[PDB]
Design a protein around this ligand. Structure first.
Ligand SMILES: O=c1[nH]cc(NCc2ccccc2)c(=O)[nH]1
Length: 165
């Protein structure tokens, strides 16, 4: 069984009228939910406008994220994988001198739609420095990427991290 933390989606931007039941009926369309909670004030019971859903598998999380935008009880909500910032860009290190743009594209396009690939070169000599930046159109690509233990591109074991503004 995959760790529960990797099967969880934070759902922001809820309608205050959304309930455990209506959040569950929505997100059960994309998989089995082992948990589904709207967060509420402890005294007033008024919704705090966010909640969480937990799927049985990571593939179900993927299915739910691929079905965005989600409109729940009339409001477009904002799902994100649980932490284990929200950015669209990664640093990729360890690619040495023989990794080309197509190696990075062929691999990373399977995580999401790529907008920019920048293979870094030395400002003086033009030689490849062995790292690159990849910008995607959406943050879930990055969120999937950084929770993997390993990344192998063009036979190299790569170090990948979020890149920030
Ligand atoms: O030449 C470049 N340098 C840096 C880039 N990324 C942004 C960045 C910078 C520093 C720390 C984190 C992220 C880029 O795209 N191209």
């Amino acid at each position: 069984k995959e760790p529960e933390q990797l099967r969880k989606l934070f759902i922001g931007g809820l309608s205050f009228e959304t309930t455990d039941e209506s959040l569950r009926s929505h997100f059960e369309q994309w998989g089995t939910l082992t948990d589904c909670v709207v967060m509420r004030d402890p005294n007033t019971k008024r919704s705090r406008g966010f909640g969480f859903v937990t799927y049985a598998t990571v593939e179900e999380v993927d299915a739910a994220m691929n079905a965005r935008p989600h409109k729940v009880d009339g409001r477009v909500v904002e799902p994100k994988r649980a932490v284990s910032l929200t950015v669209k860009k990664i640093f990729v290190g360890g690619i040495k001198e023989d990794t080309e743009e197509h190696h990075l594209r062929d691999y990373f396009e399977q995580y999401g739609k790529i907008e920019v690939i920048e293979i870094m070169t030395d400002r003086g000599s033009g030689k490849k420095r062995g790292f690159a930046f990849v910008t995607f159109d959406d943050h879930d690509s990055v969120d999937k990427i950084v929770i993997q233990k390993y990344h192998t591109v063009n036979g190299h074991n790569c170090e990948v991290r979020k890149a920030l503004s």
